[PDB]
Design a protein around this ligand. Structure first.
Ligand SMILES: C[N+](C)(C)[C@@H](Cc1cnc[nH]1)C(=O)O
Ligand SMILES: [Ca+2]
Ligand SMILES: [Cl-]
Ligand SMILES: [Cl-]
Ligand SMILES: [Cl-]
Ligand SMILES: [Cl-]
Ligand SMILES: [Cl-]
Ligand SMILES: [Fe+3]
Ligand SMILES: [Mg+2]
Length: 428
């Protein structure tokens, strides 16, 4: 954009990272849960990736500041999450120094770029850092002990008449995905824009709420195999799933270490894919595909055009959506009437990542970005296991890095992510 805007975005992302590691060294070296890296791992990994993509042209053979064997400690493919706490990692002080040295060079490089030069990698790195910021928040939410973070900033109230209800998404062709001409920092798996015919379906006006989930529990939803897939039931049994994560036996939840009542009208959060599909079956519904989800979010059947955001082309604001990390929770359903998509689906962007039934797959004409291993290894059948796509972002996602076309994904057994559920239905 303006190089000044990119600098602003990089600085904002780093400010966020540094808030998330503004704790004593022992905290940053802890493993909060075997699913998660120590925070000091993400810190150095953020710098290493910034250096690689912005200072080294994505070519590991070009020299970097770290010995290659030290650099490789931050290769997520080489080192499983649980192992990272035991690796001979850079100290927090070393990691901060490294990140700052890299950043000084990156800001200089951005100054020196020729006019009209391509800046894609800079936006890709902003996205990368913010996504690790959300990972670090997942870790801090898993941490046992007295809270390190506050309970979150104020959110708007919800309103009646939206929970449980659905909106119609009329059938026909729509444009899935985006091109760089329209979204200059869209990641490779969002491209290219192409037409898909999506039959009529209905989608939830708002996500499934906590009170609705409690009804599933109360009716024996976790005790009735018929709602679950074979794999989902097996996992429910193996893992002993009886409620969303962080829901306590006494009816409270624990959120960033804060014990509190469970708000009835918030979107349910911290459920697996398997739980989501079981709830949906029990409720008389199903999960959306990600293609259905994106049509509900972005398509305006009155103009036969995509919108940039569900509400139109205005930049996200606190009045339109719950984004950016400060709330530490999703908002009550109905809190953002002005953020509705053309079909009336609300809170599509922000609040909770929403599970879909789609595996990650390339759009026709997919081509990888400079970080070639960002999407490709996780496509269906690529050999990294089973994934399902999640859409829309959560409360933790930076507005700068989110689009209707953005695709998250995870293994269906994961629920430490800030994920919930929106229902869908066939139309006859
Ligand atoms: C798209 N997710 C969120 C699944 C990715 C983003 C990512 C960060 N560094 C490489 N990729 C992930 O956390 O592994
Ligand atoms: Ca969402
Ligand atoms: Cl990983
Ligand atoms: Cl990771
Ligand atoms: Cl596979
Ligand atoms: Cl993975
Ligand atoms: Cl899995
Ligand atoms: Fe990464
Ligand atoms: Mg309306």
């Amino acid at each position: 954009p303006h190089r000044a805007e990119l600098a602003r975005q990089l600085i904002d992302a780093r400010n966020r990272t540094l808030r998330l590691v503004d704790f004593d060294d022992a905290e940053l070296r802890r493993q909060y849960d075997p699913l998660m890296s120590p925070l000091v791992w993400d810190l150095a990994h953020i710098g290493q990736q910034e250096e690689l993509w912005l200072l080294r042209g994505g070519d590991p053979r070009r020299p970097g500041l770290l010995e290659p064997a030290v650099e490789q400690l931050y290769d997520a493919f080489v080192h499983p999450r649980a192992s990272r706490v035991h690796l001979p990692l850079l100290s927090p002080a070393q990691a901060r120094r490294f990140c700052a040295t890299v950043r000084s060079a990156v800001l200089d490089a951005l100054d020196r770029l020729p006019e009209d030069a391509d800046t894609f990698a800079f936006g890709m790195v902003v996205s990368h850092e913010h996504q690790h910021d959300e990972t670090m928040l997942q870790a801090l939410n898993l941490r046992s002990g007295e809270p390190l973070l506050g309970s979150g900033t104020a959110l708007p109230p919800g309103r009646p008449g939206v929970a449980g209800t659905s909106v119609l998404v009329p059938g026909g062709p729509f444009v899935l995905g985006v091109d760089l001409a329209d979204e200059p920092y869209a990641l490779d798996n969002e491209r290219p824009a192409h037409v898909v015919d999506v039959p009529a379906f209905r989608i939830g006006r708002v996500p499934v709420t906590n009170a609705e989930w409690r009804a599933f529990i109360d009716d024996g939803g976790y005790r009735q195999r018929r709602w679950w897939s074979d794999a989902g039931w097996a996992y429910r049994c193996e893992a002993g799933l009886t409620a969303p994560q962080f829901w306590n036996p006494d009816g409270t939840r624990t959120r960033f270490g804060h014990v509190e009542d469970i708000p009835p009208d918030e979107p349910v959060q911290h459920v697996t894919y398997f739980e989501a599909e079981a709830y949906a079956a029990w409720a008389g519904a199903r999960l959306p595909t990600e293609i259905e989800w994106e049509k509900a979010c972005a398509w305006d059947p009155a103009t036969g055009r995509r919108r940039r955001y569900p509400w139109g082309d205005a930049a996200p604001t606190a009045a339109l959506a719950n984004l950016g990390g400060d709330a530490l929770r999703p908002a009550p359903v109905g809190a953002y009437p002005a953020g509705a998509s053309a079909c009336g689906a609300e809170q599509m962007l922000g609040d909770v990542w929403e599970w879909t039934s789609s595996p990650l797959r390339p759009w026709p004409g997919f081509t990888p970005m400079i970080y070639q291993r960002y999407s490709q290894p996780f496509f269906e059948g690529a050999g990294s296991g089973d994934y399902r796509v999640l859409r829309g972002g959560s409360w933790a996602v930076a507005a700068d890095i989110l689009r209707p076309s953005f695709r998250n994904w995870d293994h269906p057994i994961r629920r430490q992510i800030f994920a919930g559920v929106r229902l869908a239905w066939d139309v006859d």
